[PDB]
Design an enzyme around this catalytic site. Structure first.
Site, PDB file in Angstrom:
ATOM      1  CB  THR A 183      38.274  66.467  36.874  1.00  0.00           C
ATOM      2  OG1 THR A 183      38.586  65.815  35.646  1.00  0.00           O
ATOM      3  CG2 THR A 183      39.340  66.111  37.874  1.00  0.00           C
TER       4      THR A 183
ATOM      5  N   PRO B 138      35.423  68.590  43.096  1.00  0.00           N
ATOM      6  CG  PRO B 138      35.361  69.357  45.301  1.00  0.00           C
ATOM      7  CD  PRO B 138      34.521  68.588  44.262  1.00  0.00           C
ATOM      8  CG  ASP B 139      42.677  70.479  43.310  1.00  0.00           C
ATOM      9  OD1 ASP B 139      43.020  69.546  44.073  1.00  0.00           O
ATOM     10  OD2 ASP B 139      43.503  71.276  42.813  1.00  0.00           O
ATOM     11  CG  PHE B 140      38.949  66.573  47.362  1.00  0.00           C
ATOM     12  CD1 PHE B 140      38.901  65.599  46.377  1.00  0.00           C
ATOM     13  CD2 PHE B 140      37.769  66.986  47.960  1.00  0.00           C
ATOM     14  CE1 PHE B 140      37.686  65.032  45.992  1.00  0.00           C
ATOM     15  CE2 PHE B 140      36.526  66.418  47.573  1.00  0.00           C
ATOM     16  CZ  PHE B 140      36.506  65.436  46.587  1.00  0.00           C
ATOM     17  NE  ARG B 141      45.892  68.880  43.919  1.00  0.00           N
ATOM     18  CZ  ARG B 141      46.547  68.936  42.764  1.00  0.00           C
ATOM     19  NH1 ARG B 141      47.776  68.444  42.667  1.00  0.00           N
ATOM     20  NH2 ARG B 141      45.968  69.500  41.709  1.00  0.00           N
TER      21      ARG B 141
ATOM     22  CG  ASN C 186      38.320  58.661  42.058  1.00  0.00           C
ATOM     23  OD1 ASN C 186      39.367  59.234  42.318  1.00  0.00           O
ATOM     24  ND2 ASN C 186      37.893  58.484  40.801  1.00  0.00           N
TER      25      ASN C 186
ATOM     26  CG  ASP D 178      33.928  59.889  42.764  1.00  0.00           C
ATOM     27  OD1 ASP D 178      33.545  58.733  42.489  1.00  0.00           O
ATOM     28  OD2 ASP D 178      34.861  60.462  42.136  1.00  0.00           O
TER      29      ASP D 178
ATOM     30  CG  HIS E  51      41.748  55.815  49.720  1.00  0.00           C
ATOM     31  ND1 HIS E  51      42.216  56.387  48.559  1.00  0.00           N
ATOM     32  CD2 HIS E  51      42.826  55.678  50.533  1.00  0.00           C
ATOM     33  CE1 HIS E  51      43.521  56.588  48.663  1.00  0.00           C
ATOM     34  NE2 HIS E  51      43.914  56.164  49.852  1.00  0.00           N
TER      35      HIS E  51
ATOM     36  CB  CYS F  41      39.312  60.732  31.886  1.00  0.00           C
ATOM     37  SG  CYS F  41      40.873  60.595  32.820  1.00  0.00           S
TER      38      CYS F  41
END
Ligand SMILES: [Zn+2]
Length: 312
Positions: A45, A50-53, A124, A126, A143, A280
């Site tokens: 973050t 971005p907040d993918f939600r 993640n 990214d 993933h 974090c």
């Protein structure tokens, strides 16, 4: 050195006390030889991911044109094989190149450099762990990754480099295998696709001998990690660094957690789990300082961020 520059150019047994301080002292003891980090979205973050939600950003605007049958279809292999465009339009936004690794990522790079990192399990996509210097061997990317790509045909599986894929996607050309013409997709693990065998084997072996678990930027009740945390030997300390502890909401997972060795920071039986609530980056800064690594981390981040700006 030149390899590092080319890499960036193409891309762009217990605790004395249940405190962060206690963990730092344990990390300096000879008993702490193998560390496993389990990381989530919270460690990226601060990089600006971005907040993918939220549909708020213009992230999915280009997609509301392909009419996906269901949300998960964009990551489902059979759908991809018939309609690859939607995924590639989204990947144009997700491919690495616009963000730099965070303090948290470079902290894991130090664990690697010092011979302490057994494995980093990440949720993640990214690519920041790799950009920070962690190698494939150090990573279990739940993933998958955009760094490697392969032809989707099981009889082929030809691999292609990041630059090969990167160029196609930015030029909006659907990647096709040069040997068999089948689609080529980044190694993101899609629904219906089998994950590398290495994932299961690491999950079955790594927690038998781990001396410390660092859980950062993720809730403890997440499909993969929930089980891994309880796999560690009973004496292995576990530290959570996240902005907040997640709440309950679901009886089975909750009960399974309480019965299987889930995190216990506060009960009368607490004895090895530590929660450090905050950003974090702040948590890794704090820990690094306790370990006497403040400057080394400092110089690492400053120097790697500058190499990224320079490219070369
Ligand atoms: Zn092929």
């Amino acid at each position: 050195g030149e390899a590092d520059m080319d890499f960036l150019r193409n891309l762009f047994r217990l605790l004395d006390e249940l405190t962060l301080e206690g963990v730092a002292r344990y990390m300096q003891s000879e008993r702490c030889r193998r560390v496993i980090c389990l990381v989530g979205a919270g460690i990226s973050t601060s990089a600006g991911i971005p907040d993918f939600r939220s549909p708020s950003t213009g992230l999915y605007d280009n997609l509301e044109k392909y009419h996906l049958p269901y949300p998960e279809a964009i990551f489902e292999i059979s759908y991809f094989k018939k309609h690859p465009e939607p995924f590639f339009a989204l990947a144009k936004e997700l491919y690495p190149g616009q963000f730099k690794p965070t303090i948290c990522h470079y902290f894991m790079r130090l664990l690697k450099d010092k011979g302490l990192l057994l494995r980093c399990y990440t949720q993640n996509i990214d690519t920041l762990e790799r950009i920070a210097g962690l190698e494939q061997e150090d990573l279990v990317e739940a993933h998958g990754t955009f760094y490697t790509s392969h032809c989707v045909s099981a009889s082929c599986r030809h691999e292609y480099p990041l630059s090969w894929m990167k160029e196609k996607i930015f030029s909006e050309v659907t990647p096709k295998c040069e040997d068999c013409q089948s689609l080529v997709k980044p190694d993101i693990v899609f629904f219906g696709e089998s994950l590398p065998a290495r994932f299961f084997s690491c999950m079955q072996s790594d927690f038998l001998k781990v001396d410390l678990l660092l859980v950062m930027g993720t809730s403890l009740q997440v499909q993969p990690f929930a089980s891994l945390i309880s796999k560690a030997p009973l004496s292995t300390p576990r530290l959570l660094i996240n902005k907040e502890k997640a709440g309950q909401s679901d009886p089975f997972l909750g009960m399974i957690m309480g019965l299987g060795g889930g995190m216990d920071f506060d009960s009368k039986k607490a004895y090895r789990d530590v929660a450090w609530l905050g950003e974090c980056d702040q948590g890794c800064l704090a820990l690094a300082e306790l370990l006497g690594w403040k400057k080394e981390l400092e110089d690492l981040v400053r120097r790697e961020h500058a190499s990224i700006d320079a490219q070369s």
